[PDB]
Amino acid sequence: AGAQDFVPHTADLAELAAAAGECRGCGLYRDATQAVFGAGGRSARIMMIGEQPGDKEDLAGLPFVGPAGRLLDRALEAADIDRDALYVTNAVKHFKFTRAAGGKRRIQKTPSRTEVVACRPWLIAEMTSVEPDVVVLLGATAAKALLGNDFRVTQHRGEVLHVDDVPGDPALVATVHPSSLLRGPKEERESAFAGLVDDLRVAADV
Ligand SMILES: O=c1cc[nH]c(=O)[nH]1
Numbered sequence: 001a002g003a004q005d006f007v008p009h010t011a012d013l014a015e016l017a018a019a020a021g022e023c024r025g026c027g028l029y030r031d032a033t034q035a036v037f038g039a040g041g042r043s044a045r046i047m048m049i050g051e052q053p054g055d056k057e058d059l060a061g062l063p064f065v066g067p068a069g070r071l072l073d074r075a076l077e078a079a080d081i082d083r084d085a086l087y088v089t090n091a092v093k094h095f096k097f098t099r100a101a102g103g104k105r106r107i108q109k110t111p112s113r114t115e116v117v118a119c120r121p122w123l124i125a126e127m128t129s130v131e132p133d134v135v136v137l138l139g140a141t142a143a144k145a146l147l148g149n150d151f152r153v154t155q156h157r158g159e160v161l162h163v164d165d166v167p168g169d170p171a172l173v174a175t176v177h178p179s180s181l182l183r184g185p186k187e188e189r190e191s192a193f194a195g196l197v198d199d200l201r202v203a204a205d206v
């Protein structure tokens, strides 16, 4: 099912990342430039999972390099977390997108639950490889990937979760996606930013 047969029997992240470049576990590899695997090392204590690569990531080959990534860097720095000590990845490894006439960017399209479940074997391989103490789930798609399709990020802010079907039983912390913090009225964005820093500090204190 899905990406399972494309995942090699190794925990080496370089070899996992190369294998993901050849994945056909769902249809998203066709239109994307390349797979965008996670970034960071296997000594990382904190793993962070977003939704999917965006336009910039699809061409950089690295996660969280665009506007959402700059906000996240801001939040990490405010939380006194070294981004270089984390392992950062996404629930889905190929950019799902469309373009609109007049657009200044390729527009992300939400992965279906089918695509998320298809790609999840890579996430399981990354978690097995890294053995994080805590997993930060950034946004609804990532959080649902590990916590169930009905899970609501908005109802469990600040909470340390543990689920039995997750390898290694890491602590799980689900928080707002940094893209959500990019727009809205200033006071709303500032309150939301503080809440993201709070959730990152809860994860870091596990
Ligand atoms: O890597 C990235 C970039 C933007 N949004 C995500 O969910 N992940």
Ligand code: SF4
Binding pocket: 002, 003, 020, 023, 024, 025, 026, 027, 028, 029, 035, 092, 093, 094, 115, 118, 119, 120, 122
């Ligand atoms: S999104 Fe995931 S499952 Fe689908 S082709 Fe890409 S790596 Fe494979």
